Amino acid sequence: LGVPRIKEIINASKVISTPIINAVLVNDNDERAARVVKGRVEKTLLSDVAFYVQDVYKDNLSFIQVRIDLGTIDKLQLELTIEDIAVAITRASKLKIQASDVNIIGKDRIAINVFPSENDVFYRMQQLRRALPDVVVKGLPDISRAVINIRDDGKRELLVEGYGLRDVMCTDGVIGSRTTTNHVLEVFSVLGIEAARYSIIREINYTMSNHGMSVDPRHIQLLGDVMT
Amino acid sequence: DEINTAQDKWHLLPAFLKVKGLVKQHLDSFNYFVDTDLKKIIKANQLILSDVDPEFYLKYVDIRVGKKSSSSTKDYLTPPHECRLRDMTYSAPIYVDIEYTRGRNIIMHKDVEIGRMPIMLRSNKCILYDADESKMAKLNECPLDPGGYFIVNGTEKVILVQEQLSKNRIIVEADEKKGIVQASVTSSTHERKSKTYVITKNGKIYLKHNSIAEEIPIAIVLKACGILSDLEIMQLVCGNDSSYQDIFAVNLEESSKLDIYTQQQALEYIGAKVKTMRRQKLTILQEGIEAIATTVIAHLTVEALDFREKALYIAMMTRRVVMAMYNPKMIDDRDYVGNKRLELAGQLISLLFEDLFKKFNNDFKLSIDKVLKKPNRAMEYDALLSINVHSNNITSGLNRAISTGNWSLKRFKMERAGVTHVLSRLSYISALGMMTRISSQFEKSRKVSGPRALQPSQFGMLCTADTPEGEACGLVKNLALMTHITTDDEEEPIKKLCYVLGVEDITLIDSASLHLNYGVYLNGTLIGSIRFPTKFVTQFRHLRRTGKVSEFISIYSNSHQMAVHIATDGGRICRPLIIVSDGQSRVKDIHLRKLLDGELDFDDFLKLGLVEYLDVNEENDSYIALYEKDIVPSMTHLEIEPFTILGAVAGLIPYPHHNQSPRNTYQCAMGKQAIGAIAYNQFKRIDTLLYLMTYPQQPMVKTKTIELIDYDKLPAGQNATVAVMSYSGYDIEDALVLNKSSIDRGFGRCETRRKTTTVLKRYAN
Amino acid sequence: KPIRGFCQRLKGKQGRFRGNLSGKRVDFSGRTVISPDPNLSID
Amino acid sequence: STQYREAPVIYRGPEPSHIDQVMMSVSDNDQALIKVLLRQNRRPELGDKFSSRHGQKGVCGIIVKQEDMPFNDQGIVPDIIMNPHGFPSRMTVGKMIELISGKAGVLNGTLEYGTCFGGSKLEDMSKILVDQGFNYSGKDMLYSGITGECLQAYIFFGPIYYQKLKHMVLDKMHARARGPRAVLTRQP
Amino acid sequence: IEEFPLKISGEEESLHVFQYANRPRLVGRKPAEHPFISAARYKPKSHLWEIDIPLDEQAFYNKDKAESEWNGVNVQTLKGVGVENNGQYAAFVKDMQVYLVPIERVAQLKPFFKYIDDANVTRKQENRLTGSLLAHKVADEEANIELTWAEGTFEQFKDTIVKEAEDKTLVALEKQEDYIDNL
Amino acid sequence: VEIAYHKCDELITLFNKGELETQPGCNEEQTLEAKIGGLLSKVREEVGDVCINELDNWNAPLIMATCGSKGSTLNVSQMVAVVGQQIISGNRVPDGFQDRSLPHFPKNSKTPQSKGFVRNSFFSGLSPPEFLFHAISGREGLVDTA
Amino acid sequence: XXXXXXRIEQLFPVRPVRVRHEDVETVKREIQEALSEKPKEAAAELELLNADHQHILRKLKKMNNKPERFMVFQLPTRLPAFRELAGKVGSIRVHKSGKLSVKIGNVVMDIGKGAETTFLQDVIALSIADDASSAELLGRVDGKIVVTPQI
Amino acid sequence: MIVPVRCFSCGKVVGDKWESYLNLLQEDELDEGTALSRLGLKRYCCRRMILTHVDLIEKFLRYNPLE
Amino acid sequence: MLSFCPSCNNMLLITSGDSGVYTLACRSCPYEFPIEGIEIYDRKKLP
Ligand SMILES: [Zn+2]
Ligand SMILES: [Zn+2]
């Protein structure tokens, strides 16, 4: 929030340290009003909802099992029971090695079949039981974390730490009209050049008003104009 | 009036400085060099041989500096001030004895000179050693000059204390974004200096070495080092811990992912990537290259069919990387004063002399070859002429390195500059603070203020206020008032003593119980485990206090990493502290009475175990009391005198604890620039620039340090009658109002003295 | 590697552009310590 | 290198110097060596730099005649006047304690101590000051030198150790109209 | 308050200790079975213990891959060196007395894969020498010292130990104050 | 300061032996750090206000702070009453030793004295550990200006 | 240990003893001697050392006539002056309160239970002679004793 | 070096007091304060001129080049 | 799995041999643990 922030803005860095998306909501409550949206925007949840990942072998069949718990999904108000986890696992597993036939055995236990110059089955099983917990079953695959905040008042908003603004505007329970990131290059790709120059002006003003500097806003407007 | 130990214990500080002065790092290092390291260099390069004529061996049997065996008395040296005047080097000859064979079966000695060694002022070899100010007056020397510097070509050159990372020690260092964890040891042996990394890449621990072409999977290296059970590898790098085993299982499996392995197979995998050796001994490119691959992988020379030491070293390094991976903050801080070693003028000059002596011997062997390469008329008579003419290269190299500060060492293959600086003669305190100066290691990534930060661990080791302004700020550090820089002590008798004290050797124990008890280390190297580590540490400290082991050997027990470390190397900064036992301080004012009476000097306080030196790592285990009035039974040591946390220069400030600290640092800068008295011979000197105050006055408010360092004898300033008031409007923003007629009467009067040198040189025609 | 080429006469702080072309040593200039004077006009 | 081109050593100094040592000698390599030491007495002027062991440096801004300086009951005048605005922001209370300690020290006949985490105690110095007839806080009542009236504030007044720093405006003053130019750039 | 004498014996006797880094010290409440040992090897001046304990072909043996990959894999090979370590003694109690016999070159017997070495050699089949280079060059040049086996003979050794300890007895005359500086 | 030292110490005893209520944004280590940081800042503020209100009229630093020529009430309170808390890299002074700032404090100590709170004023003078902590903060400022 | 990962007892896939990090220490003090089942740091180690003294004495009174057991004793290398050394060096004299001590000569030193080594230790007697050579195995080791000089 | 002739502040002649102050300290030994007051150095500036003077000329004369 | 050979304590691996049997087939040693109507499961708790 100082000279480094101004340096990043003027360099127009496509990646910045600490991006924040200030997504206001449509409802005012914690229980099942803010936390529902917060669940809609989160980093990784399979490790959060598995409560263990198994490695089952038999005479001839190798099953990667994960007995999901409903307690986490109900306490942390998420919206996914089995099949959402399954489809997320498919793309993730296909991305790393592959995903041919994922199965569900019921009772919240999704079972992944693994089948075939030797020991490839064991190597794939090892890397699978490693890389399986760290997959995204809910939320956005770019958000660092999500925090629900208070602007020294009574309404509650979530400031998220991700790199997706279109997705957060499109998520339900968030006003897409009033949702502002710190990221000028993210505003430009999503909202356009005029909103981007608004963002440049506003962020430089914010950086110069937290320090008690007094710079006439016409200088900042000229800087944004010359940039855009 | 009876001694009150709560206030007379500070007399340990004058007693300490009476025998271990402010310029003692330099003097001790140069004395050690000219007294043992010259003999060690001669023994190392004892014989120089030629390919032809096996009936010929030229031996180096004895070396000396500044004294022949023809006369009992020492050689005549030109006095250092005469060297300053005539622009000569203050140097002593380097005398050796030679066994060179005659043709007709004759064996004989001699005492020949192989150059001139520049002599540090007030060293063992210096004419100023033990002079009583009458000899000093006759020699035109100031008795208050610190010494500790060289005169080469009439210029006073100090080899500044250099601060580097500890050699042969593992530093774990994690990272963010990249998410690597890197443990590195700089193995600085006598003949080689190499870095052995243990990286993390894609969740897998690897080993990286400059010689090796590729980063090697770690389990492959652990198998190559005799640890092939593939279960003890897990028991060596994780022990019994669910998290660590989970982290390391990937590397365990990648051992087999290539293929299943034996020791010799892993050795072959290591040897397939050892780059080359400049195409000599080419007949060894086989499995037989792994041996020097593994004995070059670190500073632990393995010379047998056992790899216990090196294998466990690699395993401990890997365990450190794994602990850092699981729990960050388990990494070492590179700016911790326990991780720093101070190399000194003696060690620098030793490296320089050994390299110049190797070049001398190579050239001398070649000249011998040329002389003896004739068919006929090859009389052996006077083989020493080529030594009478090639001896000037030693003198020239030593003079050039000290004069320029550039150190071209080919063996270690580094070119460093700025080693020596001109002794600043702006003021007496300027010279004194130039000594006790420490320059930090380069390549610190100066963009950041990590090393520039003041560390809490430098308390009482480095001056808290004496750091420069400008670019250098924390990069230049000064020694605190009462400190000591340890010397290399032999680790062999200490390891035997550890075995005597209950350390079962590292070869008798199994892997499963390795992380069940504390493991005893020795200069970072695991030498066994110990039952009752605290009792072992206590017995070791008792042995150190009773004088059985050396007092500069430090032992400390680390509790997070279950280890008992013993350090014996030099370059550790340490300070004396009063031992507190059973809630009582051990000095108890009878020893203070004897100390004030004249007997019972400071070193008797060590020979009776009343005080001991603590380096920074031992303070990690101590519990030090600032004053005797606040000792609790849990405490271990007592401060001798808390103001010793400031160096010599900051000791000029009166009441520095009532000032805001940047003002104290600014005074550290300004005092070095104060105009005053330089030396008692400052009018006999002919210097390039000299500012002298006409009527110096000693401060009305001095400190203990001022009289300890004798600043009250050569003060830089005057006691101005000062009125603190706004006046005339010409005193705004720090401007001063000076009294005319104080100036007229000599207040603030000073003179500049400048030297111009010409040479009436001679010409070819 | 001290050899000084044309691309080193141009490049840098003390090179050609940044050292001579926009920013250079000037004639009829001076420098000394400053002192206060409250009797001078501010201009 | 018969005929000898002149290469005299010219003194190029703004202010005159004196010759106090001429040393004729030979160096180690046989050839004559000449050293001439030039001494230059300096009188403090405007722009000369002084410091007080507490990081409160500052140039001489004015040199005033003694009668213009304020004086106390005994006619003592300051040699230096340190502006009071340098204290509140720099927070060098050790400088004030040094003034009081040095004042009590000269009055008592003893050099005092300002040793870190110790030194001469402020209350003992105050006792000396009161016993000698001075205010305990080191503030004497002064008379203005230019009007003669009592100053309406008591002035913190006493000895302070001052260092003349090597930075003297005589060595800093520089003025160039036209002179040498670089052979390459033709620039000054 | 009672006494337990110490006897030192076996000056010329040479003793070794094996440390099997492969077999646990005990698998239940009683010590584990001593592994059957047959066809031992050793090397003088190089001190390489090599032991070949035969495995179980009855179960958990994988005969087909065993014989297809490496011809003779009946015997599990344990290889290790003996390391000099002073102050090491072996002890037992005979008549309320403890008898100490010095150990020489204790060894940690790791599993050995000789058949893998030779199978790989048959797969691949188609000068000062200081430091540890000399060690392995010696190992593969001056080698091949067979060594017979004889277990169970303990009584002759024990009755030698007792005999050599009842004939000699000497007094300690050096002060404990000089002993601390003799460490 | 005694009523504030006891508060910080009982927070330490809670965080150690039991469990103190972790903040929504801060875990046990950050909760305690922010808690007693706010405590120490408030206590320095109170002592400063008492100092400023007690100061005499014609007090020179007070005059210079009132007119705005030089210095602030914070500087006056540091000179007279208390040099509050030495903030290094944005928080209390770190551990230069094994889970401990100085060997002159017990190991695993998070008391204000041991972590950079300077109970003294510049008038009363700093004890050696406060002197070191203050030098660390001031050196950070100096390196920052470089 | 902890939640471990699942004809002949001694020929089953040998899994590592696994414990979590939350109490990796509390396991350690129990499984220092639990891996044996043999037939504040000041007071704590003193109690440990005394308990080990009792365990050593139990082992010795269990050793009184056994023909196969052994117990390796670690002794200082440069012993008190009397290897060419033979006979009655000294004794393991047991003090009061249940603690042991050793007088290797006139000097007095205290005993210790050494390190635990959870692997088989077998003692052999190499006998190489020109006629024939044999590896006279004798027995197995039951634990190590360390004897350290005291002041 | 050598004692100033005049007090820097008042201008009082203190250069005739150095030898007598040394004699009062050495012979008939007195305190520095009483010795200073016995010489008429009442003002603290005048007392400073003598109390703080360092007599470097006596050291500089040990290096006499015209012996 | 993290399973080690009873013979050489090396790392154990599963293999698909004749008739697809999932044996724990050690390398570097003639070891094999055939699974005969048994389940070998190595799970890890997740927070
Ligand atoms: Zn006067
Ligand atoms: Zn195996």
| Three-state secondary structure readout of D67-95 | HHCCECCCCCCCCEEECCCHHHHHCEHHH
CB B688 within 8 A of CB B754: yes
Residues of B in contact with F126 (CB under 8 A): 657-658
Q: Give yes or no for a contact between B407 and B420, defined as CB atoms under 8 angstroms apart.
A: no
With contact defined as beta carbons under 8 Å apart, do E73 and I30 qualify?
yes
Q: Is H28 annotated as a binding residue?
A: no
DSSP β-bridge partners for residue B612? B577
Q: Which residues pair with E52 in a beta bridge?
A: E38, E77
Q: How far is the CA of B234 from the centre of ligand 2 (A)?
A: 15
**Beta partners for B614?**
B575
Break-preceding residues in chain G (C–N over 2.5 Å): 6, 39, 82
Please check whether residue F52 touches B, CB under 8 A. Answer: no
From chain B, pick out residues whose CB is under 8 angstroms from the CB of I2.
245, 249, 252
Instruction: State how beta strands B182-188 and B150-152 pair.
Output: unpaired
CB atoms within 10 A of CB B510: 20
CB spacing of D153 vs F128 below 8 angstroms = no
SS3 per residue for A68-87: CCHHHHHHCCCCCCCHHHHH
Please tell me the distance from the alpha carbon of residue I27 to that of residue I12, in angstroms, as a whole number: 7
The two tokens of residue D154 are 């008591």
For the CA atoms of chain A, what is the radius of gyration? Answer: 22
Count of alpha carbons within 13 angstroms of residue G148, beta-carbon side: 23
Residue B133: Cβ within 10 Å count: 14
Angle at D181 between CA D178 and CA D182, to 5 degrees: 165
Alpha helix ranges (H) inside chain G? 24-30, 41-61
Dihedrals phi, psi of A71, to nearest 5 degrees: -65, -45
Residue B372 and residue B51 in contact, taking contact as beta carbons nearer than 8 Å: no
Chains C and I touch (3+ CB pairs under 8 A): no
Dihedral of alpha carbons B525, B527, B531, B537, sign: negative
Q: C25 vs D187: CB contact, 8 Å cut-off?
A: yes
- CB within 8 A of H40, min separation 6: which ones? none
Give the residues across from D51 on adjacent strands. Answer: D163
Burial (0-12, 13-18, 19+ Cβ within 10 Å), D137: middle
Q: Which residues contact G72 (CB under 8 A, 6 or more apart)?
A: E17, E88, E89, E90, E91, E103, G114, G121, G141, G143, G144, G145
Q: Are C and D touching by the rule of 3+ CB pairs within 8 Å?
A: yes
DSSP SS3 for G116? coil
Q: What sign has the CA pseudo-torsion B709, B713, B715, B718?
A: positive
DSSP state of F72: -
Instruction: Starting at the earlier edge strand, list the strands of the sheet with D18-26.
Output: B689-693, B750-760, D32-42, D18-26
Q: Which residue of E has its CA nearest to B507?
A: E83
Q: In angstroms, how far is the first alpha carbon of chain D from the final one?
A: 33
Q: How many CB atoms lie within 10 A of CB B419?
A: 21
Q: Do B512 and G118 touch (CB under 8 A)?
A: yes
* Chain G contacts in chain E segment 101-160 (CB below 8 A): 102-103, 147-155, 157-158
CA distances from H44 to D131, D155, H10 (A): 14, 16, 10
Rounded to whole angstroms, how far apart are CA atoms F85 and F47? 13
Biggest alpha carbon distance in chain C?
58
Q: Which two tokens stand for residue B262?
A: 């034996």
Give, as one character, the DSSP assignment of residue B435: T
Give all strands of the β-sheet with I32-33 in edge-to-edge order.
I14-16, I22-25, I32-33
Parallel/antiparallel/unpaired status of strands B518-522 and B563-567: parallel
Q: Helices H, strands E: what count in chain E?
A: 5, 10
Virtual torsion, Cα B119, B124, B128, B130, nearest 10 deg: 180
Looking at residue F88, the DSSP 8-state letter turns out to be B
Nearest ligand, measured from the Cα of B228: 2
Radius of gyration (C-alpha) of chain E in whole angstroms? 22
SS3 content of chain B, % helix, strand, coil (to 5): 30, 20, 45
E98: part of which helix (H) or strand (E)? strand E98-102
| CA distance linking residue B499 with residue B493, whole number of Å | 10
What is the distance between the alpha carbons of residues B704 and A20, in angstroms, rounded to a whole number?
Answer: 57
Q: Going by C-beta distance under 8 Å and a sequence separation of 6 or more, which residues neighbour residue G61?
A: none
B407 Cα to chain I: minimum distance (Å): 52
Residue B26 neighbours by CB under 8 Å, 6+ apart: B120, B147, B148, B149, B158, B159, B161, B344, B345, B346, B435
Apex CA D118: angle with CA D114 and CA D122, to 5°? Answer: 70
Is residue B201 classed as helix, strand or coil in its secondary structure? Answer: strand
User: Are the CB atoms for I23 and I36 separated by under 8 Å?
Assistant: no
Chains touching H by CB (3 or more pairs below 8 Å): B, D
Q: Which residues pair with I44 in a beta bridge?
A: A53
Q: Which residues of C touch D173 (CB under 8 A)?
A: 30-33
Kindly tell me whether chain H and chain A come into contact, counting contact as 3+ Cβ pairs under 8 Å.
Answer: no
Q: How far is the CA of C35 from the centre of ligand 1 (A)?
A: 29
CB of B98 within 8 A of CB of B384?
yes
Spatial CA neighbour of G74 closest among B502, B526, B514: B502
DSSP secondary structure letter of residue B289 = G
Produce one character per residue of B101-113: b if its CB has 16 or more CB atoms within 10 Å, e if not: beeeeeeeeeebb
Contact residues, chain I to chain B, C-beta under 8 Å: 2, 4, 8-11, 13, 27-28, 44
Contact yes or no, F with C (3+ CB pairs under 8 Å): no
Spatial contact of A51 and A98, defined as CB atoms under 8 Å apart: no
> Measuring CA to CA, which residue among B652, B670, B667, B669 is closest to residue B707?
B652
Cα–Cα distance, E115 to E69 (Å, whole number): 9
Using a CB-CB cut-off of 8 Å, the residues of chain H touching B681 are 63
Residues in chain D: 188
Assess contact for B463 and B649: CB atoms under 8 A: yes
Q: Are G75 and G104 in contact (CB under 8 A)?
A: yes
G106: nearest CB among E165, E168, E172 = E172
Q: Which two tokens stand for residue A8?
A: 């990043």
The rounded distance, in Å, linking the Cα atoms of E140 and B291 is 14
For residue B239, which of B142, B309, B323, B180 has the smallest C-alpha distance? Answer: B323
Strand, helix or coil for residue B494:
helix
> Closest approach of chain C CAs to the CA of B727, in angstroms?
11
**Across the strands, what pairs with B155?**
B152
Domains in chain I, number: 1
* CA B601 – CA B595 distance, rounded (Å): 6
Q: How far is residue B557 CA from its own chain's centroid?
A: 24
Please count the residues of chain B.
765
Which DSSP symbol is given to B444? Answer: S
Q: Which domain range does residue I30 map to?
A: 1-47
Question: Distance between CA E79 and CA D71 in Å, rounded?
Answer: 98
Q: How far apart are CA E39 and CA B681, in angstroms?
A: 87
Instruction: Report helix, strand or coil for A46.
Output: helix
DSSP conformational letter for G107: S
Distance CA E99, CA E89 (A): 9
* G119 interfacial to chain I (CB closer than 8 Å): no
For the record, the structure tokens of A186 come out as 């993210």
Partner-chain contact A57 I13, CB within 8 Å: no
Q: Which of residues 71-130 of D touch F (CB under 8 A)?
A: 84-89, 91, 93, 116-117
Integer Cα distance of A100 and A115 in angstroms: 10
> Nearest 5°: phi and psi at G133?
-135, 145
What tokens does B279 get? 């195409």
- Cβ contacts of G20 on chain B, cutoff 8 Å: 241-243
| Method used to solve the structure | cryo-EM
d(CA F135, CA F141) in angstroms, rounded, equals 10
- From D150, D129, D124, D174, select the one nearest D72 (Cα to Cα): D150
Backbone angles phi, psi at B97, to 5 degrees: -110, 145
> Phi and psi of H22, rounded to 5°?
-60, -40
Residue of C nearest to D167 (CA): C33
State the virtual CA torsion across F100, F102, F105, F106 in degrees, nearest 10.
30
B305 and E111: CB-CB below 8 Å? no
The candidate with the shortest Cα–Cα distance to A55, out of A161, A122, A156, A129, is A129
User: Is B159 in contact with B26 (CB distance < 8 Å)?
Assistant: yes
Burial label, G127 (beta-carbon count in 10 A; 0-12, 13-18, 19+): middle
DSSP letters along chain D, please? -------------SS--EEEEEEEEE-SSSSEEEEEEEEEEE---TT-EEE-SSS--EEEEEEE-GGGS-B-TT----SEEE-TTHHHHH-BHHHHHHHHHHHHHHHHT--EE--TT-SS-HHHHHHHHHHTTS-TTSEE--B-TTT-SBPSS-EEEEEEEEEEBS--GGGT-EEESS----TTT---
Determine, for residues A55 and I41 on separate chains, whether the beta-carbon distance falls below 8 Å.
yes
- The SS3 call for residue E54 is strand
Nearest chain F CA: its distance from B472 CA (Å) = 9
Is D107 in contact with D74 (CB distance < 8 Å)?
no
Under 8 Å between Cβ of B111 and B99: no
Q: Do D61 and C24 touch (CB under 8 A)?
A: no
Q: Taking Cα atoms as reference points, which of F51, F97, F94 lies closest to residue F72?
A: F51
Cβ contact B616:B556 at 8 Å: no
Question: Can you tell me the distance from the alpha carbon of B49 to that of G14, in angstroms, rounded to the nearest whole number?
Answer: 60
C4 touches chain D (CB under 8 A): no
- Is the distance from CB of E50 to CB of E76 less than 8 angstroms? no
Query: How far does the centroid of ligand 1 lie from the alpha carbon of residue H45, in Å?
Result: 4
Q: For residues B160 and B422, what is the distance between their CA atoms, to the nearest angstrom?
A: 10
CA dist D51 and D82 (Å) reads: 10
Q: How many CB atoms lie within 10 A of CB B363?
A: 13
Expressed in Å, this structure's resolution amounts to 2.8
Q: Do residues B560 and B330 make contact, with C-beta atoms less than 8 angstroms apart?
A: yes
Coil, helix or strand for B99?
strand
Angstrom CA distances, F66 to F49, F71, F73, stand at: 14, 9, 9
Going by C-beta distance under 8 Å and a sequence separation of 6 or more, which residues neighbour residue E35? E20, E23, E53, G120
Q: Which whole-number Å values give the CA distances from E164 to A5, D126, E13, E93, F101, in the listed order?
A: 86, 88, 11, 15, 62
Round to whole Å and give the CA distance between D39 and B108. 59
| Dihedrals phi, psi of D53, to nearest 5 degrees | 70, 10
Compute, in angstroms, the gap from residue D142 CA to the centroid of ligand 1: 16
Nearest-neighbour CA in chain B from D185: distance (Å): 30
- Report yes or no: B258 at the A interface, CB cutoff 8 Å: no
Give me the half-sphere count of Cα atoms (radius 13 Å) on the Cβ side of residue H48: 35
How far apart are the C-alpha atoms of B443 and B445, rounded to whole Å? Answer: 5
Q: Which residues of D touch C26 (CB under 8 A)?
A: 188
Q: Which residues contact A158 (CB under 8 A, 6 or more apart)?
A: A23, A25, A34, A37, A38, A41, A146, A147, A148, A149
| Residue B759, SS3 per DSSP | strand
Ligand whose nearest atom lies closest to the CA of E22: 2
Residue A145 CA: distances (Å) to CA of A17, A79, A129, A142, A162: 14, 18, 25, 9, 7
Nearest to B224 by CA among B177, B271, B173: B271
Touching C (3+ Cβ pairs <8 A), the chains are B, D
What residue of I is the nearest CA neighbor of A133? Answer: I46
Q: Which positions ≥6 away from B142 have C-beta within 8 Å?
A: B136, B679, B680, B681, B682
Interacting residues of A178 by C-beta distance below 8 A, sequence separation 6+: A24
Distances from the Cα of B131 to the Cα of B89, B135, B161, B538, angstroms: 21, 5, 26, 44
**Distance between CA atoms of residues B262 and E70, nearest Å:** 14
Disruptive mutation site among A16, A119, A134 for chain B (greatest number of B CBs within 10 Å)? A119
| Residue G6 at interface with chain I, using a CB cutoff of 8 Å | yes
Relative to beta strand E16-20, strand E106-112 is: parallel
Beta bridge partners of B201: B204
**B 322-381 → D contacts, CB under 8 A:** none
H46 a known binding residue? yes
3-state secondary structure of B477: strand
In degrees and rounded to multiples of 5, residue B604 shows phi and psi of -70, -30
Q: What is the least distance, in Å, from the CA of B301 to any CA of chain I? A: 28
D contacts of F75 (beta carbons < 8 Å):
88-89, 91
Q: Which residues of I are annotated as a binding site for Zn(2+)?
A: 5, 8, 26, 29
Query: Which chain D residues are closer than 8 Å to H32 by Cβ?
Result: 109-110
CA-closest candidate to residue B209, choices B227, B192, B226:
B192
In this structure, how many other beta carbons lie within 10 angstroms of the beta carbon of residue D2?
A: 2
Find where tokens 């030099």 sit.
B570
Distance from C-alpha of B510 to C-alpha of B210, rounded to nearest angstrom: 32
- Of B464, B467, B619, which is closest to F97 when you measure between CB atoms? B619
How many Cα neighbours within 13 Å face the side chain of B311? Answer: 24
Structure tokens at B51: 């390919």
Q: Chain B: nearest CA to E81, how far in angstroms?
A: 7
- Picking from G58, H60, H56, the residue whose alpha carbon sits closest to that of residue B685 is H60
